Amino acid sequence: EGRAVLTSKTVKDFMLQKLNSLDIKGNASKDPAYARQTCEAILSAVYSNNKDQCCKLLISKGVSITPFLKEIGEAAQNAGLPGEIKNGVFTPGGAGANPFVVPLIASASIKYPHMFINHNQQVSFKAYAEKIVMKEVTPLFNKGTMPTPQQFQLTIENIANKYLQNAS
């Protein structure tokens, strides 16, 4: 939106405008690498968010997310983003912190010092930021055989949620 208050989703709003004006697909249209590197890394973001979200509470139980990472690596293998594997475990190739949210959040970290001041706010900012791109990134998952962010996130979350509970 546009206003001298931008409250109720401020960055989220500017992040939303960026999200739309970032034209994740538009870049995928001009950049056949962008379309492919940010098509697997988006779901690799959920993959990592899964290892971030699941491991977050898991580091509290003293569990082992590696076996869970093995599961998101499945989705990360079946989704089309492979490239790493170890003791009976696999890791997705382009697995980072969301190539769409990185600069999206980088701009908002540069733009919104106030909202990004807290060490956990810019980290949480990218969490709902990888959720909006799913409205812009989903179309890159239309060409080929890629899973949707929500279909893949749930299947991933399903392993985060599986390791999430575990007696607790």
From Swiss-Prot:
Location of this chain's protein in the cell: Secreted
An annotated GO cellular component: extracellular region
The keyword Secreted is assigned to this record: yes
Principal subcellular localization: secreted
Taxonomic superkingdom: Bacteria
UniProt keyword list: GTPase activation, Guanine-nucleotide releasing factor, Secreted, Virulence
A biological process term (GO) from this entry: actin cytoskeleton organization
A GO term, aspect molecular function: GTPase activator activity
Region (GEF catalytic domain): 6-168
Remaining remarks: SopE2 is highly conserved among Salmonella isolates of the SARA collection.
Family affiliation: Belongs to the GEF (guanine exchange factor) SopE family.
Protein name stated in the entry: Guanine nucleotide exchange factor sopE2
The gene coding this protein: sopE2
Residues of the full protein shown: 73 to 240 of 240
